[model samples]
Target: DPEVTLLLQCPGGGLPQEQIQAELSPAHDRRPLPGGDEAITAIWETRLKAQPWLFDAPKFRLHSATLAPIGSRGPQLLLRLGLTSYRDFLGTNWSSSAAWLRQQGATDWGDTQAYLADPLGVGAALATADDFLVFLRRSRQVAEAPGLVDVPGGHPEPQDLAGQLVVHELFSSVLQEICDEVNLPLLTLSQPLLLGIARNETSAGRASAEFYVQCSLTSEQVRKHYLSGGPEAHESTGIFFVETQNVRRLPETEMWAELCPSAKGAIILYNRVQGSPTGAALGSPALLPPL
Candidate 1:
């Protein structure tokens, strides 16, 4: 069994019936997840208690059912997450759970039956410069994983959408992320190299469709020229550059130890596409079509 699984291919036409059934049926729970188990019961519990109407709220999410790999030409990972309610994935009551676990001296936070019920399709980019990858540490003020390392990104906004979903739109979202988070002028960034589409796990219970992009920019230039007083400063406590080589050799035991789960998954996919460690290709680059 391979450690990394490629779920589906791009230009994947319409959603597969089996995929839809898998999502709606209890059997989907029997399927495998890339991450470990920790349910999101706390989130829904609080939400249901506070807003009972949410139980029947109509919801839909854009789901990614494919993975496409692009080699050196423009190897990048693009991610897009979609969901109707944050409560389905993010546990607002996470603090209480954390407090309880801390008293028990527990290290593992994922040990529940929580599931990300709503599917999402959102895209973001990984600004890869030289041998390093740039990431942002979320601001402590944010409700989600604050103070954690993350890629420069956000959920797709209305401006990123077209009349319908299209491949090029993914790139549009990536550019938007770079502009918004790092404060880089869209013109300064180089052409994007897409690594693949990944169904990445952000935590034990949060997973989504992720589009990863490889942008051209050195770390120093990004820090000095682009990010000196960028918008990210408001949302991020600090910016970090992690060497791809370091991440390549990181042991699974230490996987995502300090980094966020989604960021860790992005690094793993980046290394896999780059043919790191073993220096062997994970799959034929030909599978990735040029943009």
Candidate 2:
């Protein structure tokens, strides 16, 4: 008989299957997840309570856990999971066009079961997607990178996005991602361009929505917008600007580079704007389409 093998390079690249069955794993115990870095583990250790188990290996290395008991639901099923590495289990680095984050290898827990609020603990509310947006600039020269958006665009998805060129809902999700990461005010709809779409997958092989957006803000605006983190957040950063001709010279881009479709398309459209003046619309010459 042959041993079964698991494939890890799905759309989201996490434990979708296990996440689906999380609601049913041995009552209170959890899966193992040592692959994650100390940052995630540290966060989990501080928040999660160490509980004993019946198995010989009673202690589980967990990042976070949630226990809900609505009076008669039998603990309402407490669940916990850890942030894990992609190298050992999947045999590939969790790569991304966002170079800086890629270098860290990206942590995942598709097979692990934990509530969205576990990391923060106890009554922590779910960190849900709120909105999306793309920050864009008008290229001043053609030598650097183009005014393109970031990530996977050149390729298309299996289906069109509802014929509503403007995917308002998807953009909102992106904005939510930004807000959650930065913990700041939300960007207005008019502030972003609905560029393209991308899909994230669960461990169970289900797809989640990811969108790409472009904003035509000035250089000053860019500094004021993201500089609060003071360069700490900008470090391995592949999300830099490239001039038109220079962009083509980049190493061959991977398809999974852009997680959001609109993000990929926006980058392509900006690359198309090589010459002409800054702020030129896509297909017209100078730069890209309106945001």
Candidate 3:
């Protein structure tokens, strides 16, 4: 309504067809909705008065409704309104279907990068989040809990997503992992951080970590917010905290040594936070630390 008010204002000569200037005598060119034209509103009001059904059936303004006749701009607005009319046109409520996924795993950026293309690409992610919590604690690939994998908190998505958060084929895997395992809410690009190269010896061909990066929430948010505590939870894990300085000087034998290349980037981000004037917020554009 506010946008409509802003769009309808004109001075001087009376209104002409919105598409008058755009139309060619011989149909050489086509006309588009000349949005922001004042006359279109008057014309629309007339149409609405004539056919009150339009008001009750499916009411929505067209982004490009020009000052032209109903046949011109009406169709486009009708289509958009028709979409709203659909019985099952849930724009965001459908995110509920994937709740089963969030109960389980931690979707890493590397995997998220892969899932943007295929839904079924990451079958391993289908397990419960607690399952990954346990598996991650025991895996030799990691030393201790990847600091970021704070169950109900670990966001394997990119750390900073705005700059490079655009979709790629790689994201299919990540989506599958979150949607299947931890039911990550439909999210969008948040922020992404470059984790650098991925190297694995064993999974050689079948699997080897690739360049690590993080993505942010794009569609929805995660649902199941906590992991249960028990033998299954214990067999799978434990949580520990270390000083920031300790993270900065992790020894080869320490848990940091086993981090996947991408996780390493997270650690790098962690260490950069040591007692600076701006502290851990240094990387933020508003507080970029001096080199």
Candidate 4:
């Protein structure tokens, strides 16, 4: 198989926390596959070769998103995540592709596969309070990237849908995910800022959306809540609150070495938005409008 190709548009915006909106809509616009059928086949073949174990599990499909021009709207734009298959990234296909690259002495295979299949679904919230950023250590028993250091978020699910198009569901999902991951009350969270969306393909074909949100809560409160935060079911082994000034210093930390690419992107985006000329203080509410 040759190489697989994919393209994604990255969009950014600022919003009043209270201004974000959500609604159920029947209209759906799916982005066309970036390349021809051959590209899809290449991705399938490469993923199978990279990770053979995928065939053992049941295959499935899910929706993802692509960037589009924002229409007259409440939000700057509205994007709907479309259907994607699990088989594309799961088995020997990806592993084989990596091996082939190694034989050719080529680097960046890992980065290449991430863009090809476009498996990322949705959501990452990097909450902050009292000048410290929060990160959770995944439990070893969890399915995807276990033991990895990550922010509060996960793959978007059907439950995240109201009807079809993703609107308020995205914001609500962020709240649900963060609350579930950490031991905290929903009301305690500040209206989160939708920093920016990024693509992360740390695993073979699994792509993830880095939806970074900034929460207003004290680090001490976050630590106290998470410490007694219920069972180890999704037991985030530990929570680390890095200082706000040290946000850019993540790459230098030992834990940074273990972060999934998307998580790393989340951090970078947060820092970038924080320093942007247009960016306001965290006190301002930000909304993700639907176009």
Q: Which candidate should be chosen as best, given lDDT against the real structure?
A: 4
What tens-digit string does per-residue lDDT give for candidate 3 at 1-291?
110012121111111212122111212111111232233345446556776664322211111213334344421111000011111111111123222222221243222111111011111111222211111233335433333332111212221122122123223434444333333443521222111112111111011111212224211122221133333433224333343434445534356544443334334333332223333565575654333
Evaluation by lDDT, superior candidate among 1 and 3: 1
Highest TM-score: which candidate? 4
| Candidate 4 Cα deviation (angstroms), residue 102 | 16
Per-residue lDDT tens digits for candidate 4, residues 1-291, read 011112232335434333333333222212222343355466666656877665422221223333335443444433444433454443222444534423332233323332333344444546565767778787788666778887877655444244333455556777788888786788877555565555443343343444555556678777777877556634678888777666656667787778766677667666565533343554354532212
Q: Please, what is the whole-model Cα lDDT of each candidate in the order they appear?
A: 0.47, 0.28, 0.25, 0.52
| Candidate 1 per-residue lDDT over residues 1-291, each given as its tens digit | 122233433332212112121122233222122242334554567668877876433223343332334232231222233334444434412334433433332334243322233333343435556767677777777665677777765544332132234334444666777777777767766544444444433332333334445556777877774457756444776676767646556545453666665555555556555533232353334533222
Candidate 4 Cα errors over 4 Å, as ranges: 1-75, 85-117, 141-143, 159-165, 204-207, 212-216, 277-291
Q: What is the per-residue lDDT of model 2 for residues 1-291, given as tens digits with 9 covering 90 to 100?
A: 011111111122111112211221233232333453443445434334442221111111123223243233232222232222212112111212223322332444343222121111000011112212223332334322344333321111111122122123223444555543333356421233321111222211111222223334533343355566553543213222333344443335543233232333333333332222333353463443333
Candidate 2 global CA lDDT score: 0.28
Decoy 4 TM-score against native: 0.61
Over all chains combined, what TM-score does candidate 2 have? 0.28
Ranking by TM-score: 4, 1, 2, 3
Q: TM-score, each model?
A: 0.54, 0.28, 0.26, 0.61
